[PDB]
Design a binder for this molecule. Sequence first.
Ligand SMILES: CCCCCCCCCCO[C@@H]1O[C@H](CO)[C@@H](O[C@H]2O[C@H](CO)[C@@H](O)[C@H](O)[C@H]2O)[C@H](O)[C@H]1O
Ligand SMILES: CCCCCCCCCCO[C@@H]1O[C@H](CO)[C@@H](O[C@H]2O[C@H](CO)[C@@H](O)[C@H](O)[C@H]2O)[C@H](O)[C@H]1O
Ligand SMILES: CCCCCCCCCCO[C@@H]1O[C@H](CO)[C@@H](O[C@H]2O[C@H](CO)[C@@H](O)[C@H](O)[C@H]2O)[C@H](O)[C@H]1O
Ligand SMILES: O=c1ncccn1[C@@H]1O[C@H](CO)[C@@H](O)[C@H]1O
Ligand SMILES: O=c1ncccn1[C@@H]1O[C@H](CO)[C@@H](O)[C@H]1O
Ligand SMILES: O=c1ncccn1[C@@H]1O[C@H](CO)[C@@H](O)[C@H]1O
Ligand code: NA
Ligand code: NA
Ligand code: NA
Lengths: 404, 404, 404
Amino acid sequence: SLFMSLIGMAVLLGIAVLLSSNRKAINLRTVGGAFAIQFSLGAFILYVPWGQELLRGFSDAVSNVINYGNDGTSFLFGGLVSGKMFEVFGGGGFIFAFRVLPTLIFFSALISVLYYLGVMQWVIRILGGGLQKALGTSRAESMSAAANIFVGQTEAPLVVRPFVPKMTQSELFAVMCGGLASIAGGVLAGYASMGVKIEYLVAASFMAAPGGLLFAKLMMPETEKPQDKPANVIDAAAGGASAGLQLALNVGAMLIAFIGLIALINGMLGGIGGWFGMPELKLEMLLGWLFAPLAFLIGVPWNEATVAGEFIGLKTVANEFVAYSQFAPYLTEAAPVVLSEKTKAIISFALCGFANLSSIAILLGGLGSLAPKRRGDIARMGVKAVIAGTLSNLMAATIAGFFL
Amino acid sequence: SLFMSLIGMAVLLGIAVLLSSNRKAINLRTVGGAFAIQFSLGAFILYVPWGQELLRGFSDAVSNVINYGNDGTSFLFGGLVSGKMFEVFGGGGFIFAFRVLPTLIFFSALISVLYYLGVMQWVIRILGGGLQKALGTSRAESMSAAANIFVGQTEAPLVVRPFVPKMTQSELFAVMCGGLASIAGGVLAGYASMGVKIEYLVAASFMAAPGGLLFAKLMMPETEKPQDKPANVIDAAAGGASAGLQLALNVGAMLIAFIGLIALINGMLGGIGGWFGMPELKLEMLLGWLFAPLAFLIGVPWNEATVAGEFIGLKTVANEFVAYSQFAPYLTEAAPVVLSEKTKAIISFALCGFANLSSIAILLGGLGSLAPKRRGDIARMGVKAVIAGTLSNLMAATIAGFFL
Amino acid sequence: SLFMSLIGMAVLLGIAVLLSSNRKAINLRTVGGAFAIQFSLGAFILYVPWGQELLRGFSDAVSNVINYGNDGTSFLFGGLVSGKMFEVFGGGGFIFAFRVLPTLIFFSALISVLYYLGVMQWVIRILGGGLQKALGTSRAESMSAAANIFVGQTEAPLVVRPFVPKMTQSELFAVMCGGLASIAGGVLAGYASMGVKIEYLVAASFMAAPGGLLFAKLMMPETEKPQDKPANVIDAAAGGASAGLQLALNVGAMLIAFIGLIALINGMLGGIGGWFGMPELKLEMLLGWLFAPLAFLIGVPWNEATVAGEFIGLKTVANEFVAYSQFAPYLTEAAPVVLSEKTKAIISFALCGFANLSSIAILLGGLGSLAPKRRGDIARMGVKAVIAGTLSNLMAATIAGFFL
Ligand SMILES: CCCCCCCCCCO[C@@H]1O[C@H](CO)[C@@H](O[C@H]2O[C@H](CO)[C@@H](O)[C@H](O)[C@H]2O)[C@H](O)[C@H]1O
Ligand SMILES: CCCCCCCCCCO[C@@H]1O[C@H](CO)[C@@H](O[C@H]2O[C@H](CO)[C@@H](O)[C@H](O)[C@H]2O)[C@H](O)[C@H]1O
Ligand SMILES: CCCCCCCCCCO[C@@H]1O[C@H](CO)[C@@H](O[C@H]2O[C@H](CO)[C@@H](O)[C@H](O)[C@H]2O)[C@H](O)[C@H]1O
Ligand SMILES: O=c1ncccn1[C@@H]1O[C@H](CO)[C@@H](O)[C@H]1O
Ligand SMILES: O=c1ncccn1[C@@H]1O[C@H](CO)[C@@H](O)[C@H]1O
Ligand SMILES: O=c1ncccn1[C@@H]1O[C@H](CO)[C@@H](O)[C@H]1O
Ligand code: NA
Ligand code: NA
Ligand code: NA
């Protein structure tokens, strides 16, 4: 029952220690408090009444911002995003390109505005400050952790960019992990626009800040000594819109290609598999069969572990956006397999993260531009940081399933 | 009656003199003739029969070019831009993304072709030469003024780019003002595709050349001494298409974000306003209430000044593209408020200009790349140049309303 | 009958010799074997039974990959690419922007993957090696020839990029010609998605490798002495997707502008032509009237030579993508002129090539970046290389019509 979850949490911690760079250098206060916060935060907003009300209150505000932004895309694409689309095309009336992608544009502009007004820096300074006083982590790596709740892995270190070129290997690794453990505000609203419960997305985004530091300081403890703008608000929105547009195009091209490639792979796997009496062999079968123990370990029922593995596996070997796209039909009344509400929550939390191999290349570009002489260290710690980010997402899912 | 318009023209001139860098250095021949041309040009093509026929003749040619270009977008988006769209989605059958944006691509390619053939340089040389002989303005600043009738604020100085790094502060300011007072050929056809009367757009584009110089030489008189390609036609079209595409994407992202942001602001203004007994408070109400005196001053009737202020205000605090997008429904039979034909003309002229704060950043990029050591002067004169450009648009509207 | 084709082949060879840089330096083994291979390859896969089966087998595999990739665009654009589109908009239900353009994205990602796995380098090394052993051409120029079968003119030299800056003028010219004589895998599937028979596209792509070398070594014989990566597979796909997206946007903007420009030209040609009693004068009439002898020479019947000339002419003076777009309606049951199956094949082969003037600018960018000190030689040999590429496409069409 609940005993299988606590074992899950133990196993995840165990792997991180086995993969640590120095188990004897692990700060017990740091990693103890880090797990304490993520677990308590999970308990707070998923179990206790007052915490649940604050979460559903924040989520409804996020849901209101999404609808407001939809006025923009409604103007541009008109009746192609209206209700008449469902009367004509039925299910295919929902055009992903016009329904989900424009959200990335609006939210990138909004967060750009919130940075200009100092609202973002205000929240980050509070959360980032609470972490470093409780965990003993450095100032810079804690701010980047807190920022990563709302923005992406390449945008979060920007709030501490003059400290990045000279921060320690453990600091840099943590910064990498904070980005891999979390997502971004823009894609968040995208996933929400696909049917993913906002309550789970907001919850997972916040639990990423302590969770990211947790596995950063487990797998790479501090063995060194750390240290220590647009002209107007309209320009900020325009710049954010531009950045969002570029991101929207990239995600769209990736989804067309990757899905197309998976369709090509499934065709080949059917022919190759047929040679071994398995003509029905697909990529989803391999991934499900391979990740089922991992899904079963984080709290997914035995009879649903394989289907859960398909999504968790797809997120790891590609990215969370593709995983969510294949998991979204399972959130409607036209779902091929009716899953339990607890399993739906676990997958939602386990997928909520940029933790994949492709993000290393993205970290080399973004985070590497802030410190060009540190691109070697980033590439070297890349895979370890991806694993650490994966453990953080899996821990958050285990915690989530435990309190649900 | 007509007395309120002439007062309007006087007030606008008055503000420019009060904000001048040296009232004693103002060249009476320059600013006298500049106003004389803009006023006479307004009289010519809006009042006298022969001038009205030349304007409607040029506009019908512009309207024919638009339809020819529509063959391109009709090929790409097929039935999504056909008449069947209105039978199915009704009003929402008009998809802005496919109906207006592709025009920017076609017209950018066409103007690129016209530059290659020397047709553009031919017209600019005549109009630019007539201005400098009548106003006494320098050669370079006059060519940039004439070019700005047809192209954008960053493209117009390109016809005199080797003279920009060494031109006087008054010359540079004028170049900045010529761009802010006018629009571009590409967006022109876009506004026309939204229901804005082409006759008003062409008229305002031409009146921008003397009007831009007028307020440039009022607010910043000359106190110094001024001085003095693609391989084939198919390459020119391709390059122009590419530039148009990039612009089309930017405008689209901006419209999605800005409209979405306004929707978000109106939601917040309803809550904040509710604290003061004004739950119906919106951005349009603030802008209308604040710009109504200005609209009333340029010739808009008292009972229509507030609605007119909403659009003029939105153009100033954001850009003219967003203003036109909110003003276009007022040009159809489904308009929420039926406005007088004179008020519709005034708003059309007052909106026709790139005069906004965001254009300073764009001027720093485009015009600043032509003279990197002059980016300080551009940023310093930015706001003054925006005001000057605003006065030029307001003057053109007052003149327009006077002869109508 | 078949005598008119062999005359055609002779004439094409004749022009190349007349335009040669040194007729006395032409290697008879090189150009003899080069024509021998292209002619035999044509005989193999268009005439002999076994060769026809291998071609239709490869084409059905290409047709299967296309459909697999379509799962990606089907996810993004939903019902806008469904069968319901034809029930509502009829013929206009086929939206080119969503039906053809996304193919460039998928195929660019796939070929990027195939390069990473070493599959591309494996095939190129075999075909490129067979050519240089049979023709006596250099190693580098032969690999670029073989690569050009599957990829574009700027991508093909990348497999021999450290040998490009120091290769001979004849080598560089051949590299330029190999790219101009062929197309790319991505646009190939695009043309196939417009109704162009895949069998003709695959055939022409392969016959371009010897055909490109053939006219390279005729018009520019060797008079000198020649010499002699993404972190993971998912990164490769993502990079290829990005490159495909950029290309998809460019092609789309070009098609909107060029078609729009042609519509504008036809309007002007109707007025200008009206002055000489020819109000029905259009661009298609001029191009058809001017290229009809050329089409008649390559095997197109007298009564179909003029219509065939319209398409061949449009490909030359613009690009093959625009030509195919105007030729595609002639491949359906709603064709304005029912053409013979042999004429449809000839046009398909004659159009299959990047041979146009605009590609010189593209060669200056791509191939010129690999050897910046050789941009002068590229620009100098540009037009000659375009002619050579045109002759290669015309030869392939003549050969095709001969065996059909
Ligand atoms: C959808 C509608 C929303 C309604 C909200 C309207 C907001 C109004 C924006 C005004 O902001 C100002 O704009 C200036 C222009 O960019 C800035 O000056 C900046 O640039 C000037 C010159 O360009 C310099 O003089 C200054 O030093 C520099 O602060 C200045 O910082 C900024 O405060
Ligand atoms: C929709 C259909 C429209 C129908 C219209 C057809 C127009 C025909 C275009 C031909 O233009 C020529 O093309 C050359 C190739 O770019 C240019 O040579 C340029 O480039 C050459 C080599 O690339 C150099 O030899 C030259 O010096 C240099 O002028 C040359 O300037 C230009 O006149
Ligand atoms: C749609 C689903 C498809 C299913 C297929 C799944 C394929 C699995 C990809 C794994 O590939 C590895 O990924 C590493 C990470 O990029 C690479 O390490 C590279 O980068 C490392 C660090 O980033 C370095 O340690 C290495 O030196 C360097 O080889 C490595 O080369 C590569 O073999
Ligand atoms: O780096 C990112 N920043 C913002 C949004 C997205 N991504 C990247 O793109 C992917 C898809 O959302 C993520 O897994 C991540 O690697
Ligand atoms: O600078 C520009 N050049 C061409 C088109 C548009 N714009 C900018 O974008 C805005 C929207 O049309 C203008 O206000 C102007 O600042
Ligand atoms: O250079 C290219 N590489 C890949 C795809 C396309 N093109 C260019 O764009 C044109 C349209 O397919 C070609 O004629 C060619 O010049
Ligand atoms: Na993040
Ligand atoms: Na202008
Ligand atoms: Na090629």
